[PDB]
From Swiss-Prot, chain B:
Residues 23-45 are annotated as: Disordered. It comes from Severe acute respiratory syndrome coronavirus 2 (2019-nCoV). This is Spike protein S1. Changing residue 5 to Y: In strain: Alpha/B.1.1.7, Beta/B.1.351, Gamma/P.1, Theta/P.3, Mu/B.1.621, 19B/501Y, Omicron/BA.1, Omicron/BA.2, Omicron/BA.2.12.1, Omicron/BA.2.75, Omicron/BA.4, Omicron/BA.5, Omicron/BQ.1.1, Omicron/XBB.1.5, Omicron/EG.5.1; May enhance affinity to human ACE2 receptor. Binds to host ACE2. RBD also interacts with the N-linked glycan on 'Asn-90' of ACE2. Cleavage of S generates a polybasic C-terminal sequence on S1 that binds to host Neuropilin-1 (NRP1) and Neuropilin-2 (NRP2) receptors. Interacts with host integrin alpha-5/beta-1 (ITGA5:ITGB1) and with ACE2 in complex with integrin alpha-5/beta-1 (ITGA5:ITGB1). May interact via cytoplasmic c-terminus with M protein. May interact (via N-terminus) with host bilirubin and biliverdin, thereby preventing antibody binding to the SARS-CoV-2 spike NTD via an allosteric mechanism. Attaches the virion to the cell membrane by interacting with host receptor, initiating the infection. The major receptor is host ACE2. When S2/S2' has been cleaved, binding to the receptor triggers direct fusion at the cell membrane. When S2/S2' has not been cleaved, binding to the receptor results in internalization of the virus by endocytosis using host TFRC and GRM2 and leading to fusion of the virion membrane with the host endosomal membrane. Alternatively, may use NRP1/NRP2 and integrin as entry receptors.
Amino acid sequence: FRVYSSANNCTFEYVSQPFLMKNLREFVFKNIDGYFKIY
Amino acid sequence: FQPTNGVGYQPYRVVVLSFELLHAPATVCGPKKSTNLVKNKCVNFNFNG
């Protein structure tokens, strides 16, 4: 796990949805007026 | 201190929750207590605004 060392000062958190997923998985990300929309 | 400390000397627990609203998520709502639902009648509705 060579991702990160720590977090120190932090902000909003969310950890949930233990759900899984010849096949394709499209992904669209955008942020406007502070709302991070994902499709 | 003592179990029966008088006013002005006994412990004083305080909560000072601060109000703010800026570019940070402005998650401000109203005291909208949910009410009953009716149908088949001319009525005024507020569905999530």
